[PDB]
Amino acid sequence: GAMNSSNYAELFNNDIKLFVDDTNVYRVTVHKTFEGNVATKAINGCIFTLNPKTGHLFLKIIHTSVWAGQKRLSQLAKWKTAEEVSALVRSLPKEEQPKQIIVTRKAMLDPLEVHMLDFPNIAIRPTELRLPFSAAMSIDKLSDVVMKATEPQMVLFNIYDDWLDRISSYTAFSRLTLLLRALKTNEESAKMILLSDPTITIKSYHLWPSFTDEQWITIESQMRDLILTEYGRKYNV
Amino acid sequence: MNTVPFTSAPIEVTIGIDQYSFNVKENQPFHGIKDIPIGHVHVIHFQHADNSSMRYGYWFDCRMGNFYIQYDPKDGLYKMMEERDGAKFENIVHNFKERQMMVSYPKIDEDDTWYNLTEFVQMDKIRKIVRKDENQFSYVDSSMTTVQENELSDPAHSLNYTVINFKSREAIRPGHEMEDFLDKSYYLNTVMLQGIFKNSSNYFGELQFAFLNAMFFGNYGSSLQWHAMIELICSSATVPKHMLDKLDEILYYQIKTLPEQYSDILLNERVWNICLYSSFQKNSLHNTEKIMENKYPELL
Numbered sequence: 224g225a226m227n228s229s230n231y232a233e234l235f236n237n238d239i240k241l242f243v244d245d246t247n248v249y250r251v252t253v254h255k256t257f258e259g260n261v262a263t264k265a266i267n268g269c270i271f272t273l274n275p276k277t278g279h280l281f282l283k284i285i286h287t288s289v290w291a292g293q294k295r296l297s298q299l300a301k302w303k304t305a306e307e308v309s310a311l312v313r314s315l316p317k318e319e320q321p322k323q324i325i326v327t328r329k330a331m332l333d334p335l336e337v338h339m340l341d342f343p344n345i346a347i348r349p350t351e352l353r354l355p356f357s358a359a360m361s362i363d364k365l366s367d368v369v370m371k372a373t374e375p376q377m378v379l380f381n382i383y384d385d386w387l388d389r390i391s392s393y394t395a396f397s398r399l400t401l402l403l404r405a406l407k408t409n410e411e412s413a414k415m416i417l418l419s420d421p422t423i424t425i426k427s428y429h430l431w432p433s434f435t436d437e438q439w440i441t442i443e444s445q446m447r448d449l450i451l452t453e454y455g456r457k458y459n460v
Numbered sequence: 461m462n463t464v465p466f467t468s469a470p471i472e473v474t475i476g477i478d479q480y481s482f483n484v485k486e487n488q489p490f491h492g493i494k495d496i497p498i499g500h501v502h503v504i505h506f507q508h509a510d511n512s513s514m515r516y517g518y519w520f521d522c523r524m525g526n527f528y529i530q531y532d533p534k535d536g537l538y539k540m541m542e543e544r545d546g547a548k549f550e551n552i553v554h555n556f557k558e559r560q561m562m563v564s565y566p567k568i569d570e571d572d573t574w575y576n577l578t579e580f581v582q583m584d585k586i587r588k589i590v591r592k593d594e595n596q597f598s599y600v601d602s603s604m605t606t607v608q609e610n611e612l613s614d615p616a617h618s619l620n621y622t623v624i625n626f627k628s629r630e631a632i633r634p635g636h637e638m639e640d641f642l643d644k645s646y647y648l649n650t651v652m653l654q655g656i657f658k659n660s661s662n663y664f665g666e667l668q669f670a671f672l673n674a675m676f677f678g679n680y681g682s683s684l685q686w687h688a689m690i691e692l693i694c695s696s697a698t699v700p701k702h703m704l705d706k707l708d709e710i711l712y713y714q715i716k717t718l719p720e721q722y723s724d725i726l727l728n729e730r731v732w733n734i735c736l737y738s739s740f741q742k743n744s745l746h747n748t749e750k751i752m753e754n755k756y757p758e759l760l
């Protein structure tokens with residue numbers, strides 16, 4: 224059924240599973256028309272499909288041409304998401320296909336179940352966790368590839384860089400969700416924390432900076448304080 | 461006008477005949493039901509006084525044989541049987557009518573209720589849903605499960621309604637996923653009508669039979685089927701006009717006949733609110749919407 228705090232370690236067992244987050248699929252700017260009405264302009268989006276055990280991220284870039292001439296775009300976006308995840312599963316060798324797909328928003332359940340009818344053995348599940356994957360577009364290299372795309376494209380990343388050489392999946396996912404939660408709560412401050420030290424760089428083949436173990440401890444503490452600080456600012460605490 | 465003789469009434473029971481019902485006391489001199497209108501199916505049903513558990517009954521058509529009822533003290537129920545000795549039958553009916561030991565089917569002349577509830581119900585289709593080919597009549601009870609219920613346990617005792625499943629490969633064409641799930645016209649018109657039922661009369665007959673089993677026996681699986689067959693039409697953007705108009709009439713009379721105090725258990729709020737207020741056909745069921753809003757406004 225639903226995935227929550229109680230069954231949290233299941234994410235890191237040896238059953239292949241994917242999170243699917245559709246919050247960045249259909250993205251718009253709202254603006255005024257010459258006549259003083261309101262209209263939207265779409266910008267490129269992405270499906271965020273993540274294996275939380277291995278860090279493998281299947282970033283399917285949704286180019287604005289897929290919306291041309293279509294109606295009810297927020298509804299279509301869910302079905303397009305499900306169509307693309309289905310296509311990804313079919314493209315994978317049998318032994319790489321997931322046994323479960325966890326959707327971050329329950330409105331994805333029916334579209335994904337319907338597109339996956341050919342896979343009765345793949346469980347489609349919701350989650351009670353509030354995961355910060357909407358902030359994926361605050362990772363500079365991901366945003367860059369999405370905005371530069373001129374056509375539909377899939378790009379593969381490891382969202383954990385090389386962390387699994389030194390830490391467990393559980394700890395890597397905790398670090399990821401902390402970083403993303405901080406970027407979601409105060410993007411500017413979080414990016415300042417990550418880039419303030421001129422001597423620490425991001426490898427060409429990585430998404431995040433090359434921090435030592437002790438530096439990650441400092442960074443993680445700074446991200447926690449940012450999240451708490453913003454909570455106080457929000458609720459006047 | 462045909463007759464169903466009873467051999468006797470040895471246990472206290474409430475006896476239904478179609479939408480009518482009456483109470484028979486233990487060992488009361490009751491010997492059957494006369495003046496049953498020819499031209500329709502009928503149902504004769506039972507609820508014992510000492511154990512209101514298990515409503516059960518028999519669908520029959522007096523054109524297809526001479527049927528009587530007798531209590532079986534071993535299996536503990538009133539059983540329908542067929543009389544193959546016509547002169548025995550007629551002599552038994554004549555004697556019981558002369559002694560005035562039969563109730564009369566109490567149809568008012570102006571009243572088309574039963575016809576309207578059974579317009580599309582045929583005995584031959586009932587006998588395919590309820591499989592017991594040695595009898596010309598069909599037994600149904602409160603606990604019988606449907607084939608669909610069984611898939612999600614004795615197959616011979618099952619209600620073989622046509623399986624309807626909105627999230628199934630049968631309902632969804634590869635490559636038309638969103639289209640077919642949000643507009644069920646393909647599934648209604650091509651899969652169900654053209655493919656399985658052959659025509660709308662057979663579809664409505666099964667819908668009507670499902671409702672009647674839900675109402676008279678409290679059969680939960682039948683209620684599920686009734687609601688599924690309504691939702692399938694209402695969730696289709698493209699439905700022949702004659703079917704929409706006929707559905708409105710069918711549902712109007714079903715809602716009119718439903719006992720008011722059974723609504724909480726026989727009517728699915730989600731389905732009815734979706735069908736009347738959100739679906740493609742929300743504006744096509746004027747008679748049914750009016751009776752629902754005047755009679756069950758709470759549900760909505």
Ligand SMILES: N#CCN(CCN)C(=O)c1cccs1
Pocket residue numbers: 465466467468528529530543548549550552553
């Ligand atoms: N009709 C007929 C045949 N039939 C059973 C009843 N309804 C009977 O012959 C008998 C009835 C009552 C005593 S014998």
